[PDB]
């Protein structure tokens, strides 16, 4: 996260840190708890991931230093990537992780509500991007979960900012015209959380951008409301 501040413990209890174990253990991506055995994240996070056996999901974490060999985690039973996904820049950048065991909800780990189909017309004015990503283009993963308040940008304005790309309605953009606050390397897969009528909604999945926090380059997020039926298809099967 560029231009953000340290989160307080329990502030974003749906936020997870997804780690890879191969060749050595390191943070891979962010993700969001959406159900008691379900993490919603970005499909591009799994580039080169040949098996869910190398993945570890840690919830209720503020600081990466809380993670040691004796730290409890959730194993991943299945990686479900949208089957229209080709690359982040072309959309469908969405994936589900089916966990091997269930998350016991509490004040440190609980789900974020998905947006409602009726909320496609609502204007969100209180949106935040979170993660342990870089604070600048060439940096390192942060110990403390960072947060940054970012305004949503219309599809029309986002398309003007990304000449040469096709910004679809399955994408949602967020950023200041002058830049300065955005997601960066290591934040992808994490949430864009918007508070509406005192309830937090998972509006976006951190996906891609041209650099980080540049003037007139908003962050591009998977527009979660456009995938509610896909999520229910995969999580409510049989």
């Amino acid at each position: 996260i560029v231009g953000g501040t340290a989160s307080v413990r329990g502030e974003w209890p749906w936020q997870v840190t997804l780690h890879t174990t191969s060749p050595t253990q390191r943070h891979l991506c962010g993700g969001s708890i959406i159900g008691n055995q379900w993490i919603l994240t970005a499909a591009h996070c799994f580039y080169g991931v040949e098996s869910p056996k190398i993945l570890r999901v840690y919830s209720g974490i503020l600081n990466q230093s809380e993670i040691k060999e004796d730290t409890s985690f959730f194993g991943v039973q299945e990686i479900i990537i949208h089957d229209q996904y080709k690359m982040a820049e072309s959309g469908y950048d969405i994936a589900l992780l089916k966990l091997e065991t269930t998350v016991g909800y509490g004040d440190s780990q609980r789900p974020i509500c998905l947006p409602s189909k009726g909320d496609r017309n609502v204007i969100y004015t209180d949106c935040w991007v979170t993660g342990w990503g870089y604070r600048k283009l060439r940096d390192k993963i942060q110990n403390t979960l960072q947060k940054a308040k970012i305004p949503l940008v219309t599809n029309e304005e986002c398309q003007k900012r990304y000449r040469g790309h096709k910004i679809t309605h399955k994408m949602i953009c967020a950023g200041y015209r002058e830049g300065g606050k955005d997601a960066c390397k290591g934040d992808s897969g994490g949430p864009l959380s918007c508070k509406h009528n005192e309830v937090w909604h998972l509006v976006g999945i951190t996906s891609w951008g041209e650099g980080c926090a540049q003037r007139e380059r908003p962050g591009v997020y998977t527009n979660v409301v456009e995938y509610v039926d896909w999520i229910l298809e995969k999580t409510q099967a049989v």
Binding site: I34, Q37, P115, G118, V228, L232, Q236
Partner: peptide, 7 residues
């Protein structure tokens, strides 16, 4: 939480 995800 209008949208419901079954356990």
């Amino acid at each position: 939480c209008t949208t419901k995800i079954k356990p």
